[model samples]
Target: MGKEALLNLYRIEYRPKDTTFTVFKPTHEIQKEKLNKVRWRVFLQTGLPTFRREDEFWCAGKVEKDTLYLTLSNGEIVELKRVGEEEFRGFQNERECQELFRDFLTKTKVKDKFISDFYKKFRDKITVQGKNRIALIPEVNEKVLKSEEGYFLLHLDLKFRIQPFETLQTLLERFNPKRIRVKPIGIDFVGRVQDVFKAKEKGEEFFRLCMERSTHKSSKKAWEELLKNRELREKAFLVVLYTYPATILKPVLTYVADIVRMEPGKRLNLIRYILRRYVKALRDYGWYISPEEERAKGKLNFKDTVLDAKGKNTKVITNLRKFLELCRPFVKKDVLSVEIISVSVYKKLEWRKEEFLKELINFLKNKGIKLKIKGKSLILAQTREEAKEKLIPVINKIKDVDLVIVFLEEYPKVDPYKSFLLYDFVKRELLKKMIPSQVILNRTLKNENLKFVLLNVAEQVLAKTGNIPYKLKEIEGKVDAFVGIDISRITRDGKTVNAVAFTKIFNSKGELVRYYLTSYPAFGEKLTEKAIGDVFSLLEKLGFKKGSKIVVHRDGRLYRDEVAAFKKYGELYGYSLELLEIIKRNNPRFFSNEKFIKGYFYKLSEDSVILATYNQVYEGTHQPIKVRKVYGELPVEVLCSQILSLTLMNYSSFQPIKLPATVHYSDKITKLMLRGIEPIKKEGDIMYWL
Candidate 1:
């Protein structure tokens, strides 16, 4: 009960006292655009502070074996020795301004002049896609309000708007992967299905049904089996049209994969000419613990930081009306039946189809769950191709339905529509037919905030009706399991792997009742000891006491063979481990205007810290989650309050998602096994990928 949890951090009043710098090596072959025109003529005869490309010249003093040490914003120091060739080259009293700024006094790189004119510095639209990541297009407001990751709400089946972004083409025509060519271009791809039918003609029986990629996630370690054949989905359309031009390709469209039925500007020029395969880094690859296997290692001390955000475990927070008059539903359900499916032209007003079944049986009986809207499952369709031919034969002939709401009107994959074939074929065949769906959007029955839109559709239809309507109490310490590891990249079968999903969280009382999950092949730099001894042999007989304490949280970077396969199974299950690393990409943001509550925690030292477990300031920027400890012993504010109570353990929605249900359910089972789908086994015991 000790208050003081401040953050939206700020420190470093000023800095100097040079931390030194130097790296240069070149004794042969000088053609990288003439080595930045010989480091712009050694920055016109040492005007000090420098910047060039990967082949070095990054001056600010001290570089390479040709002796070049420097640092002169008057902090003084130099050593140029043996420099000639009429001073590398250029200089006629140079100074028209180029650009280069790091110069916090003199830590390195300076000289900054501006104006490179771009549609006159500040216009509305902007573009720059993928990994150059600079989009800002604007021409959409997409509701679920507030973003840059926070106040999320997309999909009351989506039909809400409010949007900006500076000159990046409103963020590069809002880069749309509209479900990679309106879905179904899949059949577990493979080539030389015996070089297109020959090795045996259906060629090794269509290379034995294009060797197993997913008749639902399996592997005899196979990139060796296939089972859905159609000549391996017609050689996966000649393995995605052997370098473009399908010249009105015929007779291969039926087993889908965009064989031909063009227009969406003819499949955006054959997928911008085969997703324009890029591979360019030109430099920076030569390492080996060059200071503890560093690749963006250490160098973050901005000193004098205060951070403060501490307590948050007395678990007491209620908002959807005293959480529906003193909560209920930890795993309860007795008829929450749902099955709305819409479209027969918006069933054109009958009180807008019973005001969407009167606001979904009025916020699902204010969270107690009970929705009985019958009339042969209120079916009505004319196209999303008759709700994709009456979706899974009316929810696979209703086996005591619990949720399936549907009600759509396009955005079902997006774009003049094909936006990736009806939500990746209603999320890869309703998550390989395990159930739980919601969709809603016909201009969300003109949403005027029906109380934050049906209390986020009654907390994700009471978390996909498997119950757990609320949680977030325990997660204190005597830790048993609270892991989260991610490592993504998918493309199964036709190869593209990295796969390693980790979710683990069993604190039965707070109800994540061991949601355990596992995937494979992140092999090397180690991570497969039978998916970590098959989730600690089903969580070591769920009885905890052999020195308990697990913790984890990894999201990114913490290798050394994942800290030597987690301290070699933390010394064969005598437990006790902590292992943090959170680090949510491109950090360095804390801006303020007050408004942060999710257990802010901010230490920044003694084994790093900075958490803000999901906060959206009244206006913008929050960006916290930096962590990085790697091996642990606890107290980074109890690992940022058990990752701030698993970001309020996402009971699907009741707000509190800024990532931290140990990497948000390990990024939804490493993005459902990188969308080649595979979760079943009651999708790893409930909340089935929400």
Candidate 2:
């Protein structure tokens, strides 16, 4: 909607000759209102949107409030001075200013359009060129062209309005998916269940669920045993929770297993990549969902609706079924566990309707199970008098059922208006069930790939600010933007823990962005500038300064250390820095502690040994690398707080934070919360703790 801005040309590197290095240090066009709008638009539209698409977006403004700065694109930043409190004067006069804007706007606009058109025609080709430039001295295989699958889109989704092709190709080199699984978890039923119950217990409803403490011995034992099972080991488990009985669980599980087995890595990566494209790609290449597909199928039960849905509506289920059927020829009979638990609500208790007794009794009998319902556990009371006088006796007649889960309150009307209410109820019950079964789906997805992504991001960031990786927070305005995830590693005690910062770096002009997911062993533990240089060494091969955008996703622990890396790195880059730390809490290095060493080689045959030892006992001392427990200052009660609080603003904005229990609204955060995500406990009622 607004005028477009595309980056012209830029380079990022570290010069250790001096005490510091300088990222672009351009004085902003000081305006009272117009520039402010540009800044606002830049943050929301161009800046954030570009990052979301994993595409870097940048803006370079030279014309200040009615005054023009000198144009110096090739090398140096033009020096200017403030003529008035609200105005600035530059070397260029009105004619020069007009010429500069016209020329740049025209050139970049053409370049932008050229880049865009090329992407539409041959996205793969341009991307290969971009990667080639970014990958400095890359291995021959790595330097070669990549397929469309490996290409990363720039402004692909509506995450940005315009799509940049060749520039994106350049950025794709930063993302080398050597062995990573993409989009493994979608429509998470496990997360949804935790949300429903958390609201009933007095926490914010729809809060993000935290991973359960892993101390429960049964948790570990159960997972180990499950992993040992050949079926679970090879086959994928599509854990789901639904109120309907017809969704054929066995088929979906089989299909997922089939897809996973057929090139598990590629399939998952393709799925994730497609979804990313679906969410961001431009009009022609982008994916769009049809409204007709949204209509509900006339399946009487949840299982049937899912199984019989039409077109792509039934695609996931259909594929799953076909896969299961295919496996039929290999295995004698499938031992698949297709268990579906429905939280059936007896919503007619207010009318004194006792249909569940007959319905459930018949249902169980059909399955060869006889129920002995106990009255003590069955609670039916719209009012106290009815509970005391009539409900107890009514329940007593039923025998052998372990317990009757009842809703103490009246059920709301079933409609779109009350969908939130229903989600609350269903999610709550799920949490109650999950409490005893603390499953950690995360550990299994672990591979060394996560570290590589983090390292690549860190290296790019360090390149922008110089060799110092610890000065992340300090190097603000010089570069364009940054991103990170909020994740924490659990301590042995299960209560106390520290923050590990995983952050990314982007250029101010929005051309380069990198993803870093480093492990911050402790909080408050800022790495020295040397640590930043160490990271640079590790990523020396992965040419750091090629792209204009970067992303760093943390596993929720090393936030501070990552920030520190940027701050010090900026100092090394000769850039004036701006630093900011917010009130919101929401928001990796493996290396030996050894120093620089000398290496000498001794020639030897297949086996050669000449041993002579002159032993001198000496005190080997090393500096105690302190573990900064930054979270010690965190409220003790907030230790096991909502996971969303750690990094809601990092990747996407839908994070839930818990304070006095109020929700912060961002489209994504709201969807996650209202759907009954993370639940927390309070006085007596469960609430969604944001």
Candidate 3:
């Protein structure tokens, strides 16, 4: 079995390594905090074993309690182990153990009944998880299960999961919310008090002039001759200016798409563009007409009148002060006012000489442009033709006449592009509220100066945004290692159960650098010496001291008992407790609605608060009200990073990801993004003109 066997082994053929897959199920809820520790334990407990357990004839094949032996070419054996849930550990040991286990445990032989029975036993207890379709064995010809629609269910979680960046992208696309830039919208006009008065009062003077000469309706010459005055002339033109658009664009856009027959996509775009144009062009519906424009109209007083070339004056008698009081809600202060006009004017004037036209002009400007005529009534018509024929002429008759007075409505209609920009501005202001809740910038978050920057934004969102089964703080407290010790508990039956567990924070290299200690007893006093001892024992057994460095922080003794607990334990572990300094009060940069958790004693029965904590890095914080403001409220660029993290797959590389050089509201085109729809918004087409 020695020299002859070795010579025969050297003559054997090379056998290539076999590839295989293995699966494992987690025994308990393992979050990032615990996952990091597990990784450290593996690296800590197993990393040095490789060099220490080297074999003399060949490479050491790092041996450990986890390793297994596999026979390879030339009768040599390889040592291997399994370290990951899915992917193998990649080292020779990890690979050899996997292949050896697959071949050994899965082999079919009459004499290998034990191996066969083991696999059958293993399969019985294994449950398919992650809401996934069942996995196939190595030799299986069975296909993966299909969805109800005849497609594989493999991509169910794959395609539907919401990533953060995807969410950000969707929000951006839906709102097309351009952040504030150098150029702003609405530069050409300021909604002044004078325009507001003109839109309402100016219209009144025109109707008064017409009414004053109602008996001589056939000629403006007759009216001017009768009521000749500079004040009257100014008042008449002012009323004319306010009614122009009601007399013009309202009818124009109504007929536009009807003539064009726009498709649904084009229709939506046209609506958006037209709406923006309408808002910008009309300027407060002519209700809130600007005082600036009124002053522009020769700075007319209540007694002003329009001048006619034939040496005549149109009497002006529009009283804006009376209208403003009636339409106070629509007319906000002196800067914004209401204009009252009507889409029904096409019907109002058919019965008489339109005496109600005076009331309408007054009411429209007062009501923020919604017009209502009180006395005269026209019979409703059944056909659009009848309606237009009756309505259009009355509207046109008033249109050109209004501009001659005060130009109550803004002129040259706002450029459609500017309208779009203004709409974007208004929309973004609203959406910014929907975006990241808060953002804080601390110029000092350095190593030695541990900035107590509270994560209120993240905490708030994490606390309440999802459909949590229990209180957010309760769930957060469970995963939080500090709260693991001495925290109260109530069983599902409403009875309390006592259990002591301590969690420690580990770094990227899997080294435990900091630890907190706490303990609660069953229906007993709050302090427990054995529980504290047990925590230290657990950390020591886990080789926490073997970590490269140690920097411990002790929360000051609030409870004299906690001080006793710390002093008793501090002597045992040779660590010191320090008082936490009071840095700032209600610091917007570091504190918000979060409550103080230190030095405050609340029994398990009284621990009903689910507020945020500014203390610990991990647990003691509320997500909804406080923490959410910390991350979501960052500057837009920081918010972008958060979005990128949320949207991208874990461990994704952002360096090569592509982005457009520039994006604008105009770039948003008319098209539905079915797959791209996120909680924020959906994709759609750019604006279109009918």
Winner on lDDT (1 vs 3): 1
TM-score of 1: 0.26
Model 2, position 617, has a per-residue lDDT of 20
Candidate 2 per-residue lDDT over residues 409-449, each given as its tens digit: 33433221012232343333333332111111112113324
Task: Name the regions of candidate 1 deviating beyond 4 angstroms.
Answer: 1-59, 62-339, 342-369, 374-404, 407-421, 424-460, 464-473, 477-583, 586-625, 628-634, 637-641, 644-648, 652-658, 661-690
lDDT of 3 by residue, 1-690 (tens): 001000000000112232223222233344444333343233333331111112211111232344434343233443344433232233243222222222222221211342354348655522233321121121111011221122111100000111111111122223222121111011211111111123234334554555343322223443343245545433322211111211111000011011222233333233333223322432321211111100000110111122212222223213322212222221111221111122222333321123233433443344343323222222243333323433432333322111111101111222211132222322232232222111111121222122121222112211111111111011101111111122222222234344322323322111122333233335654434554565456545544443122211121113345446545764566533221111111211111122322111111111111111112233322121101111111222221222122111111111121111111111111111111222222111100100
Identify the superior model by lDDT, candidate 2 or candidate 3: 2
Candidate 3 versus truth, CA RMSD in Å, comes to 36.5
RMSD values for the candidates in order, in angstroms, are: 26.1, 28.2, 36.5
Total clashing pairs for each candidate = 36, 104, 86
Measured by C-alpha RMSD in angstroms, how accurate is candidate 2?
28.2
* Best candidate according to TM-score: 1
Score candidate 1 by lDDT.
0.44
State the C-alpha lDDT per candidate.
0.44, 0.24, 0.23
Provide TM-scores for the models. Answer: 0.26, 0.20, 0.16
Better of 1 and 2 by TM-score: 1
Which lDDT tens digits does candidate 1 get at residues 288-383? 110110011111211111110122112343244445334555546656666666544545643654665677686566555567754344445544
In model 3, the Cα lDDT at residue 454 comes to 21
Give candidate 2's error at residue 441 in angstroms.
24
